[PDB]
Design an enzyme around this catalytic site. Structure first.
Site, PDB file in Angstrom:
ATOM      1  N   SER A 122      -3.076   3.530   5.017  1.00  0.00           N
ATOM      2  CA  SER A 122      -2.108   2.922   4.125  1.00  0.00           C
ATOM      3  C   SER A 122      -2.399   1.435   4.118  1.00  0.00           C
ATOM      4  O   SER A 122      -2.042   0.739   5.067  1.00  0.00           O
ATOM      5  CB  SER A 122      -0.702   3.209   4.583  1.00  0.00           C
ATOM      6  OG  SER A 122      -0.494   2.700   5.883  1.00  0.00           O
TER       7      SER A 122
ATOM      8  N   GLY B 142       0.823  -1.184   0.000  1.00  0.00           N
ATOM      9  CA  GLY B 142       0.000   0.000   0.000  1.00  0.00           C
ATOM     10  C   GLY B 142       0.859   1.235   0.000  1.00  0.00           C
ATOM     11  O   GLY B 142       2.050   1.200   0.312  1.00  0.00           O
ATOM     12  N   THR B 143       0.219   2.338  -0.332  1.00  0.00           N
ATOM     13  CA  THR B 143       0.934   3.572  -0.508  1.00  0.00           C
ATOM     14  C   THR B 143       1.461   4.062   0.824  1.00  0.00           C
ATOM     15  O   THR B 143       1.182   3.507   1.886  1.00  0.00           O
ATOM     16  CB  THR B 143       0.040   4.624  -1.126  1.00  0.00           C
ATOM     17  OG1 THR B 143      -1.039   4.907  -0.236  1.00  0.00           O
ATOM     18  CG2 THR B 143      -0.497   4.130  -2.434  1.00  0.00           C
ATOM     19  N   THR B 144       2.245   5.116   0.746  1.00  0.00           N
ATOM     20  CA  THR B 144       2.898   5.682   1.900  1.00  0.00           C
ATOM     21  C   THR B 144       2.062   6.797   2.492  1.00  0.00           C
ATOM     22  O   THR B 144       1.379   7.526   1.776  1.00  0.00           O
ATOM     23  CB  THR B 144       4.261   6.208   1.503  1.00  0.00           C
ATOM     24  OG1 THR B 144       5.034   5.145   0.946  1.00  0.00           O
ATOM     25  CG2 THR B 144       4.946   6.754   2.684  1.00  0.00           C
TER      26      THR B 144
END
Lengths: 249, 241, 247, 250, 50, 246, 242, 204
Positions: free
Chosen positions: F77, F32-34
């Site tokens: 996230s 997942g993104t930051t």
């Protein structure tokens, strides 16, 4: 991966990696058993027609009712699992009658077909957030032949999966695939009523094991003027010999 | 295999199995039979008496009566038999209360059936290993009537039926000896058609039979063992040959 | 042979299944969770003052160490310290803090640590009867300064066993500690400990979990509690600077 | 090898037997020894305290416990399935019998109200039974003194002189080598500790033992002197020193 | 065949005594071993279910 | 995959006192993104990599921050919906902390009504845990706060937070700052100092373009509430960032 | 085959429920129980397995029981599941008397109380009872009576039965010497002979047993649930010359 | 109208030297009418006796439910009921219905078969246990009988000497009451036998 159907088969709520769930697709295979049915529509009259699977010479064959009344302007057939019918139609009529209260009018035909199809979907959530009432999606594949003012004479195919269609000339059950090609090529849009009753008493002959008589079959025909009636034996035998008097010449 | 355990789930053919497996359990149980003419309907059942200590005045009689104008038989296993009757006769008696006209027989059998098609819907419940036969007239009508129920939850009308053990012998015996368009027209004849329908499979006993008939005017009666021995033995003369 | 027929033939994933040895194993596998922090507390009595100590590790710098704590002031006169993961410590802490209360609403005084270890332990049994809930992987200590019994320590495990020790420790490192005060008590034959002040009794319990623990401790790596009549609370950092000057 | 009729309870095996009960009765036989035998004018109830560590105060928890003044108990086996039981046993005197009869119950009707608290947990999956046992012992005034056992199955065998736990048959072997018909309590009491000197290891003093009696009324425990008929309890736990002399008389 | 142990077992008493022969008595105790000690062999449970 | 038996379910314990389904959820956060949050002398600033899969997506209105009642924010996230399921419990109970007590909910007492809820999923059997690790902080009477939420049920108080696949990186650049500035950043350099990081944390995904988002809460610049950004403030912060790394 | 044994609602293809039949071998573990129907009063009987010495086998009847002053029972099966459905029976008979103000007939509760044992061989994840009974009654409609109830729910009326262990012989021995008149005292001297000749031991003491009797035998007619004490079976027991 | 003041019945209890005595009246009917000469208002369960007053439904309905129970307590505990429990049972078996109650003045009488003692008591409609030793009453005509029974009952009485002071206490009162008195009945009780006598008075 080869074990895609072997394991994801039995629980209803298991997606198989091919996207599909099987225990509904098998329900479709049930109505391939049972005895066949036909429905032909016209600008003049809708008509049905069935075999009966003469099982023994002592039964009273007015009892097994593959065709029913459901309201004065609608009538059904079914080529599937029997006992799961009488749980269907005692709902399907109940809407039409209930509808005659809340709105005082002969219900349309499709809405009825949409109330059924919003019943077999109760192995899950229905429309209005309902929860469950069963776990055995059942094979009673119907043909709802009816009349209503907006669009005239209709029929439908209502399946357990919920999705339905306004076929014009359908035939379901065991003798389908040999028939539904035969009716594919002999349906004008300008037939009569009696240019169909003889037809559906010709396909039914060739497709069925035994020979054809009055005993091993019957049929019905609604009309905006008279209503649903299931024809009589000696009336049907009129048409059967009429056919032969047309064949040889 | 794997598909032959439960009720919720289907084969990859369409067959639902457990229901088919109950009907195998019927056939591990004693016969029964039902015949109708015009002024009469009858019923038979081969019992046993294979034990001597057992008192015989309360002999195990398949028959049960739902009302005055109705009778019943069964097959299969009897631990369940007592149930359906005990809900059936309740329903007939909670009908005339609610309606003061007794049951059209077609109303009854759609409640003995109905209690079977609820016990084949959900796992966690078992079917009934049973299969009935109804016999009784309506009020204010003569037409003699007969159905059978079946744990699949279905039912059909029958002019003559035989279920339980060795029925696949007795049916074809009744496919000759009957004719729908000329029934027996006397309360003796249905019985004679009915007794010799048992004599194929019953080691020429006569203590091993029960017959119970039904007629209008809320009539029912069980017959006498000595009234059978002369309905039995006189046949044996007729196969002196 | 011990768990070979266990790990193979079930008996290790349902709670409510006995083995033919009699042993059920799930709860006997819960205790491995208690040591998943490598943490090691302590508790001792007093003349009227009780104490409990815990490490407070030095992870990556980004934490805000004011909140990392395994010492939960439950009610007044009561407190507790856990041995196990934090989340499975709260649900025990909070099921209690709303349990001392209703007592005081329904019986007219504050519960002791007796009942509070018999009640909460009368529950972890139940959750090893039913399948409501996996048994909380903890083993927790209580403290109090009661009116009728004086100081008092108690202890509770995921089965339901509870006994009021005189002094104890817990964690991965019980044997080292526990000997370094078991031998101390057979010297003097005093269930309690001297040094009236709750101050002076701390420095006793620190140094015993230094010599027998295995290293030296600053002010930040620790967090410490205390129980005195009318109160329960936590502490400052100078108590060790006023130790090594004397030595 | 396994059996596939033992991981669950509602399943019969071809010998017509059920699964988990047979193992619960083994959960107790692995447990410590406890007992109670009988006399003409009283009943005794004994066991020991295998204190795990030296630092555990072995006094904050009682193997023995009072149910009514005339009735007391002791287990052998698992513990938490005892103090969760009794807390819903003594109630049932105060709920099912007392308030609709005024007075505390007999000794066997109490047992019937335990053993179904024991059998509620062996009729539905999702419930382990109580891996314990019990020796209920008390008195009443039409059938007299009594002794009773209560297994996890819900069955309650009565008895006269019996023990349970690992050190059972060694003890039961010993009782009838010493038991009689006309025995008296203070004669039946030093028996029930020299029974326990064999099934033990190490220390054998008041702080590694505890037991009870039943007898004539102990009104000094009662508290409300002034009534003629309310004779007080009939159950008293013998203190350390009250035991710790008898051994030196032995 | 338990008897085959009896008629054996009887003489075994005489061996212990160094007598060669027996009488009825040396049988009347043999029954005390094969029969009673079969009932006092494995009837030693008390836990059972009616 | 140490235990093939002890993973098919929840509510179990391995022989090593573990439950592994939590130890597999955590590997859904990593994919997942930051997302980060810095603590400051007055308040907090949040941020996130907002990836873009196509050119067709509308900018600045597929937002990802969810704003709780005016004084605490939450950023995700991981798996988004299990997240958005979670604030949509945190956005309702806090009301039920208000209508009994009339104060806006503090931050810690908002945590224990989450960190105690999540722990409930990881002890039954008929459910699944959460695949998120959400950051949340804000402002109250007694200063600022900032926390991390983690599907084991744990939460701890952080000066700096970072999750997703840019964990090992942003756990450095948030160690540097807390050595330079023990005295507390102000709320007009941390912001641009955040943009520096997400442009540094992207480089696990130098393939694909993306979009940057910020949301910020502190007393001085906002009067004690939660708010997004707009205008020169973020645009310069963009201009600040990709400058320094070229 | 794919093993159809695991729930009592599975129906093997041959039609037979396995998990019921198992109960009908969970009964053989039990302790025998006999009842003979006289012409002037039924007798019952029993036998126990566990008979160690140091347990009060004097007053505690564990098998024999009553339901009211007319009816008696003798159990054979699990004991956890006897209290459950012998208090229920008491609670059924009274709650018939209470609302028809006449006594309970036998054929009612046996009909009822067996349908209960069928309500568990059908639905839920429940078990069927491991129980059997030997009823013994009186009533105006038929007078003396004997009845029996399996762990299925099926019942049948009889003249003399043994249940539990070793009934095979104990019927065989019985059915070849049961006269049809059998005055009551001539019935007891039959029942002991069956247990004397069928058991495993050789002692057949006074402690191992209990056998009771129903009696109409009084003048000013009424019923008498005569249960026998240890002291008078000894008279029964020496009198035969065991 | 009150429920208690409809049908009409009077009962008495009295202690004596190893004997007691209980009695009742037989009249029954609507308001300002009478239908039956014969309604045994008194009952017995085991050796323990009981007597009821007030509304007839809650007479006939209390007989059954108490009869539903003592035929269990005998089967369950293998011992008859004795009074001093029974007297508690009738309290809590009525105090459950504190609201929508029954309308009764009960009594009780019997000997305690252990100490050979006599015993009686009375109650109200929600279970206040009165434990008078000399006597106790209930019915419509209580105020017409606490006077003409007090002055007549000494202590330490003998059965027939105790008999004739019930009846005259029972007759001279019921003959003045407005809603009672078509024939009576009495029981005298000893440790091990009982007898029933009726009595003679007016009629309509």
């Amino acid at each position: 991966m080869f074990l895609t159907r072997s394991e994801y088969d039995r629980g209803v709520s298991t997606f198989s990696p091919e996207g599909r769930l099987f225990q509904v697709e098998y329900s479709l295979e049930a109505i391939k058993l049972g005895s066949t049915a036909i429905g032909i529509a016209t600008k003049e009259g809708v008509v049905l027609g069935v075999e009966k699977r003469a099982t023994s010479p002592l039964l009273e064959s007015d009892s097994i009712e593959k065709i029913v009344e459901i309201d004065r302007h609608i009538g059904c057939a079914m080529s599937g699992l029997t006992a799961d019918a009488r749980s269907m139609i005692e709902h399907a009529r109940t809407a039409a009658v209930t509808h005659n209260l809340y709105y005082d009018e002969d219900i349309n035909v499709e809405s009825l077909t949409q109330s059924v199809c919003d019943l077999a979907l109760r192995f899950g959530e229905g429309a209005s957030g309902e929860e469950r009432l069963m776990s055995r999606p059942f094979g009673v594949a119907l043909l709802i032949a009816g009349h209503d003012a907006d669009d005239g004479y209709q029929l439908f195919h209502a399946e357990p999966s919920g999705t339905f269609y306004r076929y014009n000339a359908k035939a379901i059950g065991s003798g389908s695939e040999g028939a539904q090609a035969e009716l594919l090529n002999e349906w004008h849009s300008s037939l009569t009523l009696k240019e169909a009753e003889l037809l559906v008493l010709k396909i039914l002959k060739q497709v069925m094991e035994e020979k054809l008589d009055e005993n091993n079959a019957q049929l019905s025909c609604i009309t905006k003027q008279d209503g649903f009636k299931i024809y009589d034996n000696e009336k049907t035998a009129e048409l059967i010999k009429e056919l032969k008097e047309k064949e040889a010449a | 295999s794997g598909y032959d355990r439960a009720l919720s789930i289907f084969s990859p053919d369409g067959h639902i199995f457990q229901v088919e497996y109950a009907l195998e359990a019927v056939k591990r149980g004693t016969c029964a039979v039902g015949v109708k003419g015009k002024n009469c309907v009858v019923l038979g059942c081969e019992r046993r008496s294979t034990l001597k200590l057992q008192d015989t005045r309360i002999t195990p009689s398949k028959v049960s009566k739902i009302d005055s104008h109705v009778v019943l038989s069964f097959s299969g296993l009897n631990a369940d038999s007592r149930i359906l009757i005990e809900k059936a006769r309740v329903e007939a008696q909670s009908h005339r209360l609610t309606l003061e006209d007794p049951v059209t027989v077609e109303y009854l059998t759609r409640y003995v059936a109905g209690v079977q098609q609820r016990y084949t819907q959900s796992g966690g419940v078992r079917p009934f290993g049973v299969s009935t036969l109804i016999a009784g007239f309506d009020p204010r009508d003569d037409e003699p009537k007969l159905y059978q129920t079946e744990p699949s939850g279905i039912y059909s009308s029958w002019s003559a039926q035989t279920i339980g053990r060795n029925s696949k012998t007795v049916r074809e015996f009744l496919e000759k000896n009957y004719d729908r368009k000329e029934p027996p027209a006397t309360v003796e004849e249905c019985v004679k058609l009915t007794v010799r329908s048992l004599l194929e499979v019953v080691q020429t006993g006569a203590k091993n039979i029960e017959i119970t008939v039904v007629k209008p005017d809320s009539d029912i009666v069980a017959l006498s063992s000595e009234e059978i021995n002369q309905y039995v033995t006189q046949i044996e003369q007729e196969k002196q040959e | 042979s011990g768990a070979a027929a266990a790990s193979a033939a079930g008996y290790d994933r349902h709670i409510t299944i006995f083995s033919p040895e009699g042993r059920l194993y799930q709860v006997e596998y819960a205790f491995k969770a208690t040591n998943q922090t490598n943490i090691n507390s302590l508790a001792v009595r007093g003349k009227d003052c009780t104490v409990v100590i815990s490490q407070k590790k030095v992870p990556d710098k980004l934490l805000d160490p004011t909140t990392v704590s395994y010492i939960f002031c439950i009610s007044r006169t009561i407190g507790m310290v856990v041995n196990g993961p934090i989340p499975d410590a709260r649900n025990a802490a909070l099921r209690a803090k709303a349990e001392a209360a209703e007592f005081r609403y329904k019986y007219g005084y504050d519960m002791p640590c007796d009942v509070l270890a018999k009640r909460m332990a009368n529950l972890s049994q139940i959750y090893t009867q039913r399948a409501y809930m996996r048994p909380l992987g903890v083993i927790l200590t209580f403290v109090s300064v009661d009116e009728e019994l004086g100081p008092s320590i108690y202890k509770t495990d995921p089965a339901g066993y509870y006994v009021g020790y005189k002094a104890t420790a817990t964690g991965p490192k019980q044997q080292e500690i526990t000997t370094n005060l078991e031998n101390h008590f057979k010297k003097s034959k005093i269930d309690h400990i001297n040094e009236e002040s709750w101050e002076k009794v701390v420095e006793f319990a620190i140094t015993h979990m230094i010599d027998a623990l295995g290293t030296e401790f600053s002010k930040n790596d620790l967090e410490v509690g205390v129980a005195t009549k009318d109160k329960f609370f936590t502490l400052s950092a100078e108590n060790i600077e006023e130790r090594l000057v004397a030595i | 090898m396994t059996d596939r009729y033992s991981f669950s309870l509602t399943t019969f095996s071809p010998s017509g037997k059920l699964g988990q009960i047979d193992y619960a009765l083994t959960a107790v036989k692995q447990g410590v020894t406890s007992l109670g035998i009988k006399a003409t004018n009283g009943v005794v109830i004994a066991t020991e305290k295998k204190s795990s560590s030296p630092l555990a105060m072995s006094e904050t928890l009682s193997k023995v416990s009072l149910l009514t003044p005339d009735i007391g108990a002791v287990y052998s086996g698992m513990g938490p399935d005892y103090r969760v039981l009794v807390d819903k046993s003594r109630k049932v005197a105060h709920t099912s019998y007392k308030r609709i009869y005024g007075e505390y119950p007999p000794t066997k009707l109490l047992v019937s109200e335990v053993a179904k608290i024991m059998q509620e947990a062996t009729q539905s999956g999702g419930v382990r039974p109580f891996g314990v046992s019990l020796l209920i012992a008390g008195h009443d005034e039409f059938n007299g003194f009594s002794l009773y056992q209560v297994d996890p199955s819900g069955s309650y065998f009565p008895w006269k002189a019996t023990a349970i736990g690992k050190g059972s048959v060694a003890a039961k072997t010993f009782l009838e080598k010493r038991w009689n018909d006309e025995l008296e309590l203070e004669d039946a009491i030093h028996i029930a500790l020299l029974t326990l000197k064999e099934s033990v290891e190490g220390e054998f003093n008041g702080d590694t033992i505890e037991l009870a009696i039943i007898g004539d009324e102990n009104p000094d425990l009662l508290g409300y002197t002034g009534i003629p008929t309310d004779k007080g309890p009939r159950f008293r736990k013998l203190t350390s020193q009250e035991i710790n002399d008898r051994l030196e008389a032995l | 065949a338990d008897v085959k142990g009896v008629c054996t077992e009887a003489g075994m008493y005489a061996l212990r005594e160094r007598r060669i022969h027996v009488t009825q008595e040396d049988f009347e105790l043999a029954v005390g071993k094969v029969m009673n000690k079969n009932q006092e062999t494995a009837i030693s449970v008390a836990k059972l279910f009616k | 995959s140490i235990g093939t038996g002890y993973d098919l379910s929840n509510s179990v314990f391995s022989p090593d006192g573990r439950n592994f389904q939590v130890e597999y959820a955590v590997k859904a956060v990593e994919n997942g993104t930051t997302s980060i949050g810095i603590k400051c002398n007055d308040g907090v600033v949040f941020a996130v990599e907002k990836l873009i899969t196509s050119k067709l997506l509308v900018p600045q209105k597929n937002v990802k921050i969810q704003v709780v009642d005016r004084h605490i924010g939450c950023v995700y996230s991981g798996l988004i919906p299990d997240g958005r399921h979670l604030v949509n419990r945190g956005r309702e109970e806090a009301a039920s902390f208000k209508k009994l007590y009339k104060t806006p909910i503090p931050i810690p007492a908002f945590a224990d009504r989450l960190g105690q809820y999540v722990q409930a999923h990881t002890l039954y059997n008929s459910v699944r845990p959460f695949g998120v690790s959400t950051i949340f902080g804000g402002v109250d009477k007694n200063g600022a706060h900032l926390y991390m939420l983690e599907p084991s049920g744990s939460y701890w108080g952080y000066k700096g937070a970072a999750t997703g696949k840019g964990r090992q990186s942003a756990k450095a650049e948030l160690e540097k700052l807390v050595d330079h500035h023990p005295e507390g950043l102000s709320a007009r350099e941390a912001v641009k100092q955040a943009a520096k990081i997400i442009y540094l944390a992207h480089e696990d995904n130098k393939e694909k373009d993306f979009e940057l988002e910020i949301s910020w809460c502190s007393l001085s610049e906002t009067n004690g509430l939660h708010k997004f950004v707009k205008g020169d403030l973020l645009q310069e912060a963009i201009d600040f960032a990709q400058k320094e790394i070229n | 085959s794919r093993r159809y044994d695991s729930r009592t609602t599975i129906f093997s293809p041959e039609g037979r429920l396995y998990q019921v039949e198992y109960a009908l071998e969970s009964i053989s573990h039990a302790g025998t129980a006999i009842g003979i129907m006289a012409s002037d009063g039924i007798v019952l009987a029993a036998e126990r397995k566990v008979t160690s010495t140091l347990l009060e086998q004097d007053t505690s009847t564990e098998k024999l029981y009553k339901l009211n002053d007319k009816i008696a029972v003798a159990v054979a099966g699990l004991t956890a599941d006897a209290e459950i459905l012998i208090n229920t029976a008491r609670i059924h008979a009274q709650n018939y008397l209470k609302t028809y103000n006449e006594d309970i007939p036998v054929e009612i509760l046996v009909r009822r109380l067996s349908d209960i044992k069928q309500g568990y061989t059908q639905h839920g994840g429940l078990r069927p009872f491991g129980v059997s009974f030997i009823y013994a009654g009186y009533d105006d409609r038929y007078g003396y009576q004997l009845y029996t109830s399996n762990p299925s729910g099926n019942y049948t009326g009889w003249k003399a039965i043994s249940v539990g262990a070793n009934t095979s012989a104990a019927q065989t021995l019985l059915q070849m010497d049961y006269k049809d008149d059998m005055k009551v005292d001539d019935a007891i001297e039959l029942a002991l002979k069956t247990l004397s000749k069928t058991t495993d031991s050789s002692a057949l003491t006074y402690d191992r047993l209990e056998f009771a009797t129903i009696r109409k035998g009084a003048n000013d007619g009424e019923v008498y649930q005569k249960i026998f004490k240890p002291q008078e079976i000894k008279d029964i027991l020496v009198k035969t010359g065991i | 109208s009150d429920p208690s003041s409809i049908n009409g019945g009077i009962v008495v209890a009295m202690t004596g030297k190893d004997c007691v005595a209980i009695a009742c009246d037989l009249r029954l009917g609507s308001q300002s009418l009478g239908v039956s000469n014969k309604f045994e208002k008194i009952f017995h369960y085991g050796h323990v006796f009981l007597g009821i007053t007030g509304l007839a439904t809650d007479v006939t309905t209390l007989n059954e439910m108490f009869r539903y129970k003592t035929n269990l307590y005998k089967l369950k505990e293998e011992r008859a009921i004795e009074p001093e429990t029974f007297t508690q049972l009738v309290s809590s078996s009525l105090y459950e219905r504190r609201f929508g109650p029954y309308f009764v003045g009960p009594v009780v009488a019997g000997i305690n078969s252990k100490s050979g003692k006599p015993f009686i008591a009375g109650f109200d409609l929600i279970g206040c246990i009165d434990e008078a030793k000399d006597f106790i009453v209930s019915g419509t005509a209580s105020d017409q009988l606490f006077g003409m029974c007090e002055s007549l009952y000494e202590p330490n009485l003998e059965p027939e000497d105790l008999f004739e002071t019930i009846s005259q206490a029972l007759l001279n009162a019921a003959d003045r009451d407005a809603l009672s008195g078509w024939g009576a009945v009495v029981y005298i009780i000893k440790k091990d036998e009982v007898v029933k006598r009726y009595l003679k008075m007016r009629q309509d």
